[PDB]
């Protein structure tokens, strides 16, 4: 039982303006520790019908602990607002990094892929959660260069060995064929999402692209995958497995889930226990001088300065142990 308020934080820098609120680099007065605080106006959440997604995100963040999932330290509410105090990822979004570098080496994509697989294996097997929104923008880096997944509002809870989902949701460029078919789909949608992020990392483009979402969806449903002529055969076998359009043929589509991907020769020599204990060497270390250095966050936002109703959300509030 540790109740917290907006007064227990200093408000240092705007990290980013979200659709329904903003994310602010804050410092906890009592401890000196920095966090990213996500602040949503209740009026907005209710008017845009975001309440269910807000509560899902609260629940998944409370019920999850993993080194490559963003940790929730506190959630609390005011008369005005809902607040999530989260683990600050100083490294910014892999989207930032891949925009600057164009491609990652296969070894660098293998590292990020192993940390994503460990996170998703945990969500599916330990928590019965399907994430459904994997993409570069939700893959952040911590100060050491390890992955931190953010944005859990699109998760589905309570999904088991084979159980199915109906909600049409995700990001258009990342949607699995079985989601676009609008039949029921299972946890394998996450593995299609892995394939798309890993393809982008190693190939420097989406596997399917058109600006128009409807033609983009015809490519995802109909076009056969191609690869650049430089891509290694283990990389090409992994991406071809992950980007099978029929989820029952997909790598990770069977009852073994993530263990089938973990067994793939592209990950040969990876010790999954060592992945989890952060024993492996990040191939890129963010060059952040201090914790308030926001060089990996975009200019529009870092520059903006603001230095420092509606209902009650029953039992929203939470405080982590330790």
């Amino acid at each position: 039982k540790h109740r917290v308020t907006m007064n227990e934080f200093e408000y240092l820098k705007l990290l980013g303006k979200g659709t329904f609120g903003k994310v602010i680099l804050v410092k906890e007065k009592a401890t000196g520790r920095y966090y990213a605080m996500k602040i949503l106006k209740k009026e907005v959440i209710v008017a845009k019908d975001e309440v269910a997604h807000t509560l899902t995100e609260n629940r998944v963040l409370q019920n999850s602990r993993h080194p490559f999932l963003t940790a929730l330290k506190y959630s609390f509410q005011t008369h005005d607002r809902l607040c999530f105090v989260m683990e600050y990822a100083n490294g910014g979004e892999l989207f930032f990094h891949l925009s600057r570098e164009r491609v990652f080496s296969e070894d660098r994509a293998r590292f990020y892929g192993a940390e994503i697989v460990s996170a998703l294996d945990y969500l599916h097997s330990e928590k019965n959660v399907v994430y459904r929104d994997l993409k570069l923008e939700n893959l952040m880096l911590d100060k050491d260069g390890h992955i931190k997944i953010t944005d859990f509002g699109l998760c589905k809870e309570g999904i088991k060995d084979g159980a199915t989902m109906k909600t049409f949701c995700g990001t258009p460029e990342y949607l699995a064929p079985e989601v676009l078919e609008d039949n029921d789909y299972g946890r394998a949608v996450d593995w299609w999402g892995l394939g798309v992020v890993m393809y982008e990392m190693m190939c420097g483009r989406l596997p399917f692209y058109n600006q128009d979402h409807e033609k983009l969806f015809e490519l995802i449903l109909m076009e056969e995958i191609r690869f650049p002529r430089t891509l290694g055969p283990e990389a090409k076998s992994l991406l071809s497995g992950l980007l099978k359009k029929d989820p029952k043929q997909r790598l990770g589509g069977g009852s073994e889930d993530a263990k089938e991907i973990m067994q793939h020769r592209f990950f040969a020599g990876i010790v999954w226990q060592h992945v989890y204990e952060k024993k492996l060497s990040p191939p890129f270390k963010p060059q952040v001088t201090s914790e308030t250095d926001t060089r990996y966050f975009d200019e529009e936002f870092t520059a903006q300065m603001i230095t420092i109703r509606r209902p009650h959300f029953p039992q929203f509030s939470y405080s982590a142990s330790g």
Partner: peptide, 10 residues
């Protein structure tokens, strides 16, 4: 570099 994307939910 593709443009930044947003999620959706129906």
């Amino acid at each position: 570099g593709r443009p930044r994307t947003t999620x959706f939910a129906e």
